[PDB]
Amino acid sequence: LADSSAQQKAVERRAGDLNVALERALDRIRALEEEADGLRQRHAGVDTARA
Amino acid sequence: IQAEEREVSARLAAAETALGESDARRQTQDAALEDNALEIDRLRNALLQSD
């Protein structure tokens, strides 16, 4: 039981840590999608005013 | 000199007819070309949005 509860706590900690990592990485994906969007519209506008 | 005056007045009459016809045609195609400029602006805008 000592061994098993040790593993229980350890995997619980690592799961929480990678949960935080997924949260921040998903937030970063959202940020990059917004940024790429902004590039899209502004690039369209510039390339068209240049035409 | 009377005959020469007649000839010069005939040339003047023909020139005055051609000038009026040119000015009228110019006004028609001038309005048309302005409308063409506006319409091309519209098509460029629709290309903006759809692209």
Coordinates of all heavy atoms in Angstrom, one line a residue:
Chain A
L1 N 0.8 -1.2 0.0 CA 0.0 0.0 0.0 C 0.9 1.2 0.0 O 0.5 2.2 -0.6 CB -0.9 0.0 1.2 CG -2.0 1.2 1.2 CD1 -3.2 0.7 1.9 CD2 -1.5 2.4 1.9
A2 N 2.0 1.2 0.8 CA 2.9 2.3 0.7 C 3.4 2.6 -0.7 O 3.3 3.7 -1.2 CB 4.1 2.1 1.7
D3 N 3.8 1.5 -1.4 CA 4.3 1.7 -2.7 C 3.2 2.2 -3.6 O 3.4 3.2 -4.4 CB 4.8 0.3 -3.3 CG 6.0 -0.1 -2.6 OD1 6.8 0.7 -2.2 OD2 6.2 -1.4 -2.5
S4 N 2.0 1.7 -3.5 CA 0.9 2.0 -4.4 C 0.4 3.5 -4.2 O 0.1 4.2 -5.2 CB -0.3 1.0 -4.3 OG -1.3 1.3 -5.2
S5 N 0.3 3.9 -2.9 CA -0.1 5.3 -2.7 C 1.0 6.2 -3.1 O 0.7 7.3 -3.6 CB -0.4 5.5 -1.2 OG -0.9 6.8 -1.0
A6 N 2.3 5.8 -3.0 CA 3.3 6.6 -3.6 C 3.1 6.9 -5.0 O 3.2 8.0 -5.5 CB 4.7 6.0 -3.3
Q7 N 2.9 5.8 -5.8 CA 2.6 5.9 -7.2 C 1.4 6.7 -7.5 O 1.4 7.5 -8.4 CB 2.5 4.5 -7.9 CG 3.7 3.7 -7.6 CD 5.0 4.5 -7.6 OE1 5.4 5.1 -8.6 NE2 5.6 4.6 -6.4
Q8 N 0.3 6.5 -6.7 CA -0.9 7.3 -6.8 C -0.6 8.8 -6.7 O -1.0 9.6 -7.6 CB -1.9 6.9 -5.8 CG -3.1 7.8 -5.6 CD -4.2 7.6 -6.6 OE1 -4.2 6.7 -7.4 NE2 -5.3 8.4 -6.5
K9 N 0.1 9.2 -5.7 CA 0.4 10.6 -5.5 C 1.3 11.1 -6.6 O 1.2 12.2 -7.1 CB 1.1 10.9 -4.2 CG 0.2 10.4 -3.0 CD -1.2 11.0 -3.0 CE -2.0 10.5 -1.9 NZ -2.4 9.1 -2.0
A10 N 2.3 10.3 -7.0 CA 3.2 10.7 -8.1 C 2.6 11.0 -9.4 O 2.7 12.0 -10.0 CB 4.4 9.7 -8.2
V11 N 1.8 10.0 -9.8 CA 1.1 10.2 -11.1 C 0.0 11.3 -11.0 O -0.2 12.0 -12.0 CB 0.5 8.9 -11.6 CG1 1.6 7.8 -11.8 CG2 -0.6 8.4 -10.6
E12 N -0.6 11.5 -9.8 CA -1.5 12.6 -9.7 C -0.8 13.9 -9.9 O -1.3 14.8 -10.6 CB -2.2 12.5 -8.4 CG -3.4 13.5 -8.2 CD -2.9 14.9 -7.9 OE1 -1.8 15.0 -7.3 OE2 -3.7 15.8 -8.2
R13 N 0.4 14.1 -9.3 CA 1.2 15.3 -9.4 C 1.6 15.5 -10.9 O 1.4 16.6 -11.4 CB 2.4 15.2 -8.6 CG 2.2 15.4 -7.1 CD 2.1 16.9 -6.7 NE 0.9 17.6 -7.1 CZ -0.2 17.6 -6.4 NH1 -0.2 16.9 -5.2 NH2 -1.3 18.2 -6.8
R14 N 2.1 14.4 -11.6 CA 2.5 14.6 -12.9 C 1.3 14.9 -13.8 O 1.4 15.7 -14.8 CB 3.2 13.4 -13.4 CG 4.3 13.7 -14.4 CD 4.7 12.6 -15.3 NE 3.6 12.2 -16.2 CZ 3.8 11.4 -17.2 NH1 5.0 10.9 -17.5 NH2 2.8 11.2 -18.0
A15 N 0.1 14.4 -13.5 CA -1.1 14.7 -14.3 C -1.5 16.1 -14.1 O -1.8 16.8 -15.1 CB -2.2 13.7 -13.9
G16 N -1.4 16.6 -12.9 CA -1.7 18.0 -12.7 C -0.8 18.9 -13.5 O -1.2 19.9 -14.1
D17 N 0.5 18.6 -13.4 CA 1.5 19.4 -14.1 C 1.2 19.4 -15.6 O 1.2 20.5 -16.2 CB 2.9 18.9 -13.8 CG 4.0 19.8 -14.3 OD1 3.7 21.0 -14.7 OD2 5.2 19.5 -14.2
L18 N 1.0 18.3 -16.2 CA 0.8 18.3 -17.7 C -0.6 18.8 -18.0 O -0.9 19.3 -19.1 CB 0.9 16.9 -18.3 CG 2.3 16.7 -18.8 CD1 3.4 16.6 -17.7 CD2 2.4 15.5 -19.8
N19 N -1.5 18.9 -17.0 CA -2.8 19.6 -17.2 C -2.5 21.1 -17.3 O -3.1 21.7 -18.2 CB -3.7 19.3 -16.1 CG -5.0 20.2 -16.2 OD1 -5.2 21.1 -15.4 ND2 -5.8 20.0 -17.2
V20 N -1.6 21.6 -16.5 CA -1.3 23.0 -16.6 C -0.6 23.3 -17.9 O -0.8 24.3 -18.6 CB -0.4 23.4 -15.4 CG1 0.1 24.9 -15.6 CG2 -1.1 23.3 -14.1
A21 N 0.3 22.3 -18.4 CA 1.0 22.5 -19.6 C 0.0 22.5 -20.8 O 0.1 23.3 -21.7 CB 2.0 21.4 -19.8
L22 N -1.0 21.6 -20.8 CA -2.0 21.6 -21.8 C -2.8 22.9 -21.8 O -3.1 23.4 -22.9 CB -2.9 20.4 -21.7 CG -3.5 20.0 -23.1 CD1 -2.3 19.7 -24.0 CD2 -4.3 18.7 -22.9
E23 N -3.2 23.4 -20.7 CA -3.9 24.6 -20.6 C -3.2 25.7 -21.3 O -3.7 26.5 -22.1 CB -4.3 25.0 -19.2 CG -5.4 24.1 -18.6 CD -6.4 23.7 -19.6 OE1 -7.3 24.5 -19.9 OE2 -6.4 22.6 -20.1
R24 N -1.9 25.9 -20.9 CA -1.1 27.0 -21.4 C -0.8 26.8 -22.9 O -0.8 27.8 -23.7 CB 0.2 27.2 -20.6 CG 1.1 26.0 -20.6 CD 2.2 26.0 -21.7 NE 3.2 25.0 -21.6 CZ 4.1 24.7 -22.5 NH1 4.2 25.4 -23.6 NH2 5.0 23.7 -22.3
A25 N -0.6 25.5 -23.4 CA -0.4 25.3 -24.8 C -1.6 25.6 -25.6 O -1.5 26.0 -26.7 CB 0.2 23.9 -25.0
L26 N -2.8 25.2 -25.1 CA -4.0 25.5 -25.8 C -4.2 27.0 -25.9 O -4.7 27.5 -26.9 CB -5.2 24.8 -25.2 CG -6.5 24.8 -25.9 CD1 -7.3 23.6 -25.5 CD2 -7.3 26.0 -25.5
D27 N -3.9 27.7 -24.8 CA -4.0 29.2 -24.8 C -3.1 29.7 -25.9 O -3.4 30.7 -26.6 CB -3.7 29.8 -23.5 CG -4.7 29.3 -22.4 OD1 -5.9 29.0 -22.8 OD2 -4.4 29.3 -21.2
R28 N -1.8 29.2 -26.0 CA -0.9 29.6 -27.0 C -1.4 29.3 -28.4 O -1.1 30.1 -29.3 CB 0.5 29.0 -26.7 CG 1.3 29.7 -25.6 CD 2.7 29.2 -25.6 NE 3.5 29.8 -24.6 CZ 4.8 29.5 -24.3 NH1 5.4 28.5 -24.9 NH2 5.4 30.2 -23.3
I29 N -2.0 28.2 -28.6 CA -2.6 27.9 -29.9 C -3.6 28.9 -30.3 O -3.7 29.4 -31.4 CB -3.1 26.5 -30.0 CG1 -2.0 25.5 -29.9 CG2 -4.0 26.3 -31.2 CD1 -1.1 25.6 -31.1
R30 N -4.5 29.3 -29.3 CA -5.5 30.3 -29.6 C -4.8 31.6 -29.9 O -5.3 32.3 -30.9 CB -6.4 30.4 -28.4 CG -7.1 29.2 -28.0 CD -8.0 28.6 -29.2 NE -8.7 29.7 -29.9 CZ -9.8 30.3 -29.4 NH1 -10.3 30.0 -28.2 NH2 -10.3 31.3 -30.1
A31 N -3.8 32.0 -29.2 CA -3.1 33.3 -29.5 C -2.5 33.2 -30.9 O -2.7 34.2 -31.7 CB -2.0 33.5 -28.5
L32 N -1.9 32.1 -31.3 CA -1.3 32.1 -32.6 C -2.3 32.0 -33.7 O -2.1 32.6 -34.8 CB -0.3 30.8 -32.7 CG 1.1 31.2 -32.5 CD1 2.0 29.9 -32.6 CD2 1.6 32.2 -33.5
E33 N -3.5 31.4 -33.5 CA -4.5 31.4 -34.5 C -5.0 32.9 -34.7 O -5.2 33.3 -35.8 CB -5.6 30.5 -34.2 CG -6.6 30.9 -33.1 CD -7.7 31.8 -33.5 OE1 -7.9 31.9 -34.8 OE2 -8.3 32.5 -32.7
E34 N -5.2 33.6 -33.6 CA -5.6 35.0 -33.7 C -4.6 35.8 -34.5 O -4.9 36.6 -35.4 CB -5.9 35.6 -32.4 CG -6.3 37.1 -32.4 CD -7.7 37.2 -33.0 OE1 -8.5 36.3 -33.0 OE2 -7.9 38.4 -33.6
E35 N -3.3 35.6 -34.2 CA -2.2 36.4 -34.8 C -2.2 36.0 -36.3 O -2.0 36.9 -37.2 CB -0.9 36.1 -34.2 CG 0.3 37.0 -34.6 CD 0.9 36.5 -35.9 OE1 0.9 35.3 -36.2 OE2 1.5 37.3 -36.6
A36 N -2.3 34.8 -36.7 CA -2.3 34.4 -38.1 C -3.5 35.0 -38.8 O -3.4 35.4 -39.9 CB -2.2 32.9 -38.2
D37 N -4.6 35.0 -38.1 CA -5.8 35.7 -38.7 C -5.4 37.1 -39.0 O -5.6 37.6 -40.2 CB -6.9 35.6 -37.7 CG -8.3 35.6 -38.5 OD1 -8.4 36.3 -39.5 OD2 -9.1 34.8 -38.0
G38 N -4.9 37.9 -38.1 CA -4.5 39.3 -38.3 C -3.6 39.5 -39.4 O -3.8 40.3 -40.3
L39 N -2.5 38.6 -39.5 CA -1.7 38.6 -40.7 C -2.5 38.4 -42.0 O -2.3 39.1 -43.0 CB -0.7 37.5 -40.6 CG 0.5 37.8 -39.7 CD1 1.4 36.5 -39.6 CD2 1.3 38.9 -40.4
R40 N -3.5 37.5 -41.9 CA -4.3 37.3 -43.1 C -5.0 38.5 -43.6 O -4.8 38.9 -44.8 CB -5.3 36.1 -42.9 CG -4.5 34.8 -42.8 CD -5.5 33.6 -42.8 NE -6.4 33.5 -41.7 CZ -6.2 32.9 -40.6 NH1 -5.0 32.3 -40.4 NH2 -7.1 32.9 -39.6
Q41 N -5.8 39.2 -42.7 CA -6.5 40.3 -43.3 C -5.6 41.5 -43.7 O -5.8 42.1 -44.7 CB -7.6 40.8 -42.3 CG -7.2 41.6 -41.1 CD -7.0 40.8 -39.9 OE1 -7.0 39.6 -40.0 NE2 -6.9 41.4 -38.7
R42 N -4.6 41.7 -42.8 CA -3.8 42.9 -43.1 C -2.9 42.7 -44.4 O -2.7 43.6 -45.2 CB -2.9 43.2 -41.9 CG -2.1 44.5 -42.1 CD -0.7 44.2 -42.7 NE 0.2 43.7 -41.8 CZ 1.2 44.5 -41.2 NH1 1.3 45.8 -41.4 NH2 2.0 43.9 -40.3
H43 N -2.5 41.4 -44.6 CA -1.7 41.1 -45.8 C -2.6 41.2 -47.0 O -2.2 41.7 -48.1 CB -1.2 39.7 -45.7 CG -0.3 39.3 -46.9 ND1 0.9 39.9 -47.1 CD2 -0.5 38.4 -47.9 CE1 1.4 39.4 -48.2 NE2 0.6 38.5 -48.7
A44 N -3.9 40.8 -46.9 CA -4.8 41.0 -48.0 C -5.0 42.5 -48.4 O -4.9 42.9 -49.5 CB -6.2 40.4 -47.7
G45 N -5.2 43.3 -47.3 CA -5.4 44.7 -47.5 C -4.1 45.4 -48.2 O -4.3 46.2 -49.1
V46 N -2.9 45.1 -47.7 CA -1.7 45.7 -48.2 C -1.5 45.2 -49.7 O -1.2 46.0 -50.6 CB -0.5 45.3 -47.4 CG1 0.8 45.5 -48.1 CG2 -0.5 46.2 -46.1
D47 N -1.6 43.9 -49.9 CA -1.4 43.4 -51.3 C -2.5 43.9 -52.3 O -2.2 44.0 -53.5 CB -1.5 41.9 -51.3 CG -0.9 41.3 -52.5 OD1 -0.4 42.0 -53.4 OD2 -0.9 40.0 -52.7
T48 N -3.6 44.4 -51.8 CA -4.6 44.9 -52.7 C -4.5 46.4 -52.9 O -4.6 46.9 -54.0 CB -6.0 44.6 -52.1 OG1 -6.1 45.1 -50.8 CG2 -6.3 43.2 -52.3
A49 N -4.1 47.2 -51.9 CA -3.8 48.6 -52.1 C -2.6 48.7 -52.9 O -2.5 49.7 -53.7 CB -3.6 49.3 -50.7
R50 N -1.6 47.8 -52.9 CA -0.5 47.8 -53.8 C -0.9 47.4 -55.2 O -0.2 47.7 -56.1 CB 0.6 46.8 -53.3 CG 1.8 46.8 -54.1 CD 1.8 45.5 -55.0 NE 3.0 45.4 -55.7 CZ 3.1 44.8 -56.9 NH1 1.9 44.3 -57.5 NH2 4.2 44.7 -57.6
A51 N -2.0 46.8 -55.4 CA -2.5 46.6 -56.8 C -3.2 47.9 -57.3 O -3.1 48.2 -58.5 CB -3.4 45.4 -56.9
Chain B
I1 N -12.0 87.7 -103.9 CA -11.9 87.7 -102.5 C -13.2 87.2 -101.9 O -13.3 86.6 -100.8 CB -11.5 89.1 -102.0 CG1 -10.1 89.4 -102.5 CG2 -11.4 89.1 -100.5 CD1 -9.1 88.3 -102.2
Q2 N -14.3 87.5 -102.6 CA -15.6 87.0 -102.1 C -15.6 85.5 -102.2 O -16.1 84.8 -101.2 CB -16.7 87.6 -103.0 CG -18.1 87.4 -102.4 CD -18.5 88.4 -101.4 OE1 -17.6 89.2 -100.9 NE2 -19.8 88.4 -101.0
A3 N -15.2 84.9 -103.3 CA -15.1 83.4 -103.3 C -14.2 82.8 -102.3 O -14.6 81.8 -101.6 CB -14.7 83.0 -104.7
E4 N -13.1 83.4 -102.0 CA -12.1 82.9 -101.0 C -12.8 83.0 -99.6 O -12.6 82.1 -98.8 CB -10.8 83.7 -101.1 CG -9.7 83.0 -100.3 CD -8.6 84.0 -99.9 OE1 -8.9 84.8 -98.9 OE2 -7.5 84.0 -100.4
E5 N -13.5 84.1 -99.4 CA -14.2 84.2 -98.1 C -15.3 83.1 -98.0 O -15.4 82.6 -96.9 CB -14.9 85.6 -98.1 CG -15.9 85.7 -96.9 CD -15.9 87.2 -96.4 OE1 -15.0 87.6 -95.7 OE2 -16.9 87.9 -96.7
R6 N -15.9 82.8 -99.1 CA -16.9 81.7 -99.1 C -16.2 80.4 -98.7 O -16.7 79.6 -97.9 CB -17.6 81.5 -100.4 CG -18.6 82.6 -100.7 CD -19.8 82.6 -99.8 NE -19.5 83.1 -98.4 CZ -19.2 84.3 -98.1 NH1 -19.1 85.3 -99.0 NH2 -18.9 84.7 -96.8
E7 N -15.0 80.1 -99.3 CA -14.3 78.9 -99.0 C -13.9 78.8 -97.5 O -14.0 77.8 -96.9 CB -13.1 78.8 -99.9 CG -12.6 77.3 -100.1 CD -11.8 76.9 -98.9 OE1 -11.2 77.8 -98.2 OE2 -11.7 75.7 -98.6
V8 N -13.4 79.9 -97.0 CA -12.9 80.0 -95.7 C -14.1 79.8 -94.7 O -13.9 79.1 -93.7 CB -12.1 81.2 -95.4 CG1 -11.6 81.2 -93.9 CG2 -10.9 81.3 -96.3
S9 N -15.2 80.4 -95.0 CA -16.4 80.2 -94.1 C -16.9 78.8 -94.2 O -17.4 78.3 -93.2 CB -17.5 81.2 -94.5 OG -18.0 80.9 -95.8
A10 N -16.7 78.1 -95.3 CA -17.1 76.7 -95.4 C -16.2 75.8 -94.6 O -16.7 75.0 -93.8 CB -17.1 76.2 -96.9
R11 N -14.9 76.1 -94.6 CA -14.0 75.3 -93.8 C -14.3 75.6 -92.3 O -14.3 74.7 -91.5 CB -12.6 75.7 -94.0 CG -11.6 74.9 -93.2 CD -10.1 75.1 -93.6 NE -9.7 74.5 -94.9 CZ -10.0 75.0 -96.1 NH1 -10.7 76.1 -96.2 NH2 -9.6 74.3 -97.1
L12 N -14.6 76.9 -92.0 CA -15.0 77.2 -90.6 C -16.3 76.5 -90.2 O -16.4 76.1 -89.0 CB -15.2 78.7 -90.5 CG -15.3 79.1 -89.0 CD1 -14.5 80.3 -88.7 CD2 -16.8 79.4 -88.8
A13 N -17.3 76.4 -91.1 CA -18.5 75.7 -90.7 C -18.3 74.3 -90.4 O -18.8 73.7 -89.5 CB -19.6 75.9 -91.8
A14 N -17.5 73.6 -91.3 CA -17.2 72.2 -91.1 C -16.4 72.0 -89.8 O -16.7 71.0 -89.0 CB -16.4 71.6 -92.3
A15 N -15.4 72.9 -89.5 CA -14.7 72.8 -88.3 C -15.6 73.0 -87.1 O -15.5 72.3 -86.0 CB -13.6 73.8 -88.2
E16 N -16.5 73.9 -87.1 CA -17.4 74.1 -86.0 C -18.4 73.0 -85.8 O -18.8 72.7 -84.7 CB -18.2 75.4 -86.2 CG -19.0 75.9 -84.9 CD -18.1 76.2 -83.7 OE1 -16.9 75.9 -83.8 OE2 -18.6 76.7 -82.7
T17 N -18.8 72.3 -86.9 CA -19.6 71.1 -86.7 C -18.8 69.9 -86.0 O -19.3 69.3 -85.1 CB -20.2 70.6 -88.0 OG1 -19.1 70.6 -89.0 CG2 -21.2 71.6 -88.5
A18 N -17.6 69.7 -86.5 CA -16.8 68.6 -86.0 C -16.4 68.9 -84.5 O -16.3 68.0 -83.7 CB -15.5 68.4 -86.8
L19 N -16.1 70.2 -84.2 CA -15.8 70.5 -82.8 C -16.9 70.2 -81.9 O -16.7 69.6 -80.8 CB -15.4 72.0 -82.7 CG -14.9 72.4 -81.3 CD1 -13.8 73.4 -81.5 CD2 -16.0 73.1 -80.5
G20 N -18.2 70.6 -82.3 CA -19.3 70.3 -81.4 C -19.5 68.8 -81.3 O -19.8 68.3 -80.2
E21 N -19.4 68.0 -82.4 CA -19.6 66.6 -82.3 C -18.5 66.0 -81.4 O -18.9 65.1 -80.6 CB -19.6 66.0 -83.7 CG -20.8 66.5 -84.6 CD -20.4 66.6 -86.0 OE1 -19.2 66.7 -86.3 OE2 -21.3 66.6 -86.9
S22 N -17.3 66.4 -81.5 CA -16.2 65.9 -80.6 C -16.5 66.2 -79.2 O -16.3 65.4 -78.3 CB -14.9 66.5 -81.0 OG -14.7 67.7 -80.4
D23 N -17.0 67.4 -78.9 CA -17.2 67.8 -77.5 C -18.3 67.0 -76.9 O -18.2 66.5 -75.8 CB -17.5 69.3 -77.4 CG -17.1 69.8 -76.0 OD1 -16.5 69.1 -75.3 OD2 -17.4 71.0 -75.7
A24 N -19.4 66.7 -77.7 CA -20.5 65.9 -77.2 C -20.0 64.5 -76.9 O -20.3 63.9 -75.9 CB -21.7 65.9 -78.2
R25 N -19.4 63.9 -77.9 CA -18.9 62.5 -77.8 C -17.9 62.4 -76.6 O -17.9 61.5 -75.8 CB -18.2 62.0 -79.0 CG -18.0 60.5 -79.2 CD -16.9 60.2 -80.1 NE -15.6 60.1 -79.5 CZ -14.5 59.6 -80.1 NH1 -14.5 59.3 -81.3 NH2 -13.4 59.5 -79.4
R26 N -17.1 63.5 -76.4 CA -16.2 63.5 -75.3 C -16.9 63.5 -74.0 O -16.5 62.9 -73.0 CB -15.3 64.7 -75.4 CG -14.2 64.8 -74.3 CD -13.3 65.9 -74.6 NE -12.8 66.5 -73.3 CZ -13.6 67.3 -72.6 NH1 -14.8 67.6 -72.9 NH2 -13.1 67.8 -71.4
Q27 N -18.0 64.3 -73.9 CA -18.8 64.3 -72.6 C -19.4 63.0 -72.3 O -19.4 62.5 -71.2 CB -19.8 65.4 -72.7 CG -19.2 66.8 -72.6 CD -17.9 66.8 -71.8 OE1 -16.8 66.8 -72.4 NE2 -18.1 67.0 -70.5
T28 N -20.0 62.3 -73.4 CA -20.6 61.0 -73.1 C -19.5 60.0 -72.6 O -19.7 59.4 -71.6 CB -21.2 60.5 -74.4 OG1 -20.2 60.2 -75.4 CG2 -22.2 61.5 -74.9
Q29 N -18.4 59.9 -73.4 CA -17.4 58.9 -72.9 C -16.7 59.4 -71.7 O -16.2 58.5 -70.9 CB -16.4 58.6 -74.0 CG -16.9 57.8 -75.2 CD -15.8 57.3 -76.1 OE1 -14.7 57.7 -76.0 NE2 -16.2 56.5 -77.1
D30 N -16.7 60.7 -71.3 CA -16.1 61.1 -70.1 C -17.0 60.6 -68.9 O -16.4 60.1 -67.9 CB -16.0 62.6 -70.1 CG -15.0 63.1 -69.0 OD1 -14.5 62.3 -68.3 OD2 -14.8 64.3 -68.9
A31 N -18.3 60.8 -69.0 CA -19.1 60.3 -67.9 C -19.0 58.8 -67.9 O -18.9 58.2 -66.8 CB -20.6 60.7 -68.2
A32 N -19.0 58.1 -69.0 CA -18.9 56.7 -69.0 C -17.6 56.2 -68.4 O -17.5 55.2 -67.6 CB -19.0 56.1 -70.4
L33 N -16.5 56.9 -68.6 CA -15.2 56.5 -68.0 C -15.1 56.8 -66.6 O -14.5 56.0 -65.8 CB -14.0 57.3 -68.7 CG -12.7 56.8 -68.3 CD1 -12.5 55.4 -68.8 CD2 -11.6 57.7 -69.0
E34 N -15.8 57.9 -66.1 CA -15.9 58.1 -64.6 C -16.7 56.9 -64.0 O -16.3 56.4 -62.9 CB -16.5 59.4 -64.4 CG -15.5 60.6 -64.5 CD -14.2 60.2 -64.0 OE1 -13.9 60.4 -62.8 OE2 -13.3 59.8 -64.8
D35 N -17.8 56.6 -64.6 CA -18.6 55.4 -64.1 C -17.8 54.2 -64.1 O -17.9 53.3 -63.2 CB -19.9 55.3 -64.9 CG -20.7 56.6 -65.0 OD1 -20.4 57.5 -64.2 OD2 -21.6 56.7 -65.9
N36 N -17.0 53.9 -65.1 CA -16.1 52.8 -65.2 C -15.1 52.8 -64.1 O -14.9 51.7 -63.5 CB -15.5 52.8 -66.6 CG -14.7 51.5 -66.9 OD1 -14.4 50.7 -65.9 ND2 -14.6 51.2 -68.1
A37 N -14.6 54.0 -63.7 CA -13.7 54.0 -62.6 C -14.3 53.6 -61.3 O -13.8 52.8 -60.6 CB -13.1 55.4 -62.5
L38 N -15.5 54.1 -61.1 CA -16.3 53.8 -59.9 C -16.6 52.3 -59.8 O -16.4 51.6 -58.8 CB -17.5 54.6 -59.7 CG -17.5 55.9 -59.0 CD1 -17.1 55.7 -57.5 CD2 -16.5 56.9 -59.6
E39 N -17.1 51.7 -60.9 CA -17.4 50.3 -61.0 C -16.2 49.4 -60.7 O -16.3 48.4 -60.1 CB -18.1 50.0 -62.3 CG -18.4 48.5 -62.5 CD -17.2 47.8 -63.1 OE1 -16.2 48.4 -63.4 OE2 -17.3 46.5 -63.3
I40 N -15.1 49.8 -61.3 CA -13.9 49.0 -61.1 C -13.5 49.1 -59.6 O -13.0 48.1 -59.0 CB -12.7 49.5 -62.0 CG1 -12.9 48.9 -63.4 CG2 -11.4 49.0 -61.4 CD1 -12.9 47.4 -63.4
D41 N -13.7 50.3 -59.0 CA -13.4 50.3 -57.6 C -14.3 49.3 -56.8 O -13.9 48.6 -55.9 CB -13.7 51.8 -57.1 CG -12.7 52.8 -57.7 OD1 -11.6 52.4 -58.1 OD2 -13.1 53.9 -57.8
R42 N -15.6 49.3 -57.2 CA -16.5 48.3 -56.5 C -16.0 46.9 -56.7 O -16.1 46.1 -55.7 CB -17.9 48.5 -57.1 CG -19.0 47.7 -56.3 CD -19.1 46.3 -56.7 NE -20.1 46.1 -57.8 CZ -20.2 45.0 -58.5 NH1 -19.4 44.0 -58.2 NH2 -21.1 44.9 -59.5
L43 N -15.7 46.5 -57.9 CA -15.2 45.1 -58.1 C -13.9 44.8 -57.3 O -13.8 43.7 -56.8 CB -15.0 44.8 -59.6 CG -16.2 44.4 -60.4 CD1 -16.7 43.1 -59.9 CD2 -17.3 45.5 -60.3
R44 N -13.0 45.8 -57.2 CA -11.9 45.6 -56.4 C -12.3 45.4 -55.0 O -11.6 44.6 -54.2 CB -10.9 46.8 -56.5 CG -10.5 47.0 -58.0 CD -9.3 48.0 -58.0 NE -8.3 47.6 -57.2 CZ -7.5 46.6 -57.4 NH1 -7.6 45.8 -58.5 NH2 -6.5 46.3 -56.5
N45 N -13.3 46.1 -54.5 CA -13.7 45.9 -53.1 C -14.4 44.5 -52.9 O -14.1 43.9 -51.9 CB -14.7 47.0 -52.7 CG -14.1 48.4 -52.6 OD1 -13.2 48.6 -51.8 ND2 -14.5 49.3 -53.5
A46 N -15.2 44.1 -53.8 CA -15.8 42.7 -53.7 C -14.7 41.7 -53.8 O -14.8 40.7 -53.1 CB -16.8 42.5 -54.8
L47 N -13.7 41.9 -54.6 CA -12.5 41.0 -54.6 C -11.9 41.0 -53.2 O -11.5 40.0 -52.7 CB -11.6 41.4 -55.7 CG -10.6 40.2 -56.1 CD1 -11.4 39.3 -57.0 CD2 -9.4 40.8 -56.8
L48 N -11.7 42.2 -52.6 CA -11.2 42.3 -51.2 C -12.0 41.3 -50.3 O -11.3 40.5 -49.7 CB -11.4 43.7 -50.7 CG -10.7 44.9 -51.2 CD1 -11.2 46.2 -50.5 CD2 -9.2 44.8 -50.9
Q49 N -13.3 41.5 -50.2 CA -14.0 40.7 -49.2 C -14.0 39.2 -49.5 O -13.7 38.4 -48.6 CB -15.5 41.2 -49.1 CG -16.3 41.1 -50.3 CD -17.0 39.7 -50.5 OE1 -17.2 39.1 -49.5 NE2 -17.2 39.3 -51.7
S50 N -14.2 38.9 -50.8 CA -14.3 37.4 -51.1 C -12.9 36.8 -51.0 O -12.8 35.6 -50.6 CB -14.9 37.2 -52.5 OG -14.9 35.8 -52.8
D51 N -11.8 37.5 -51.3 CA -10.5 36.9 -51.1 C -10.1 36.8 -49.7 O -9.6 35.8 -49.2 CB -9.5 37.7 -51.9 CG -8.1 37.1 -51.9 OD1 -7.9 36.1 -52.6 OD2 -7.2 37.6 -51.1

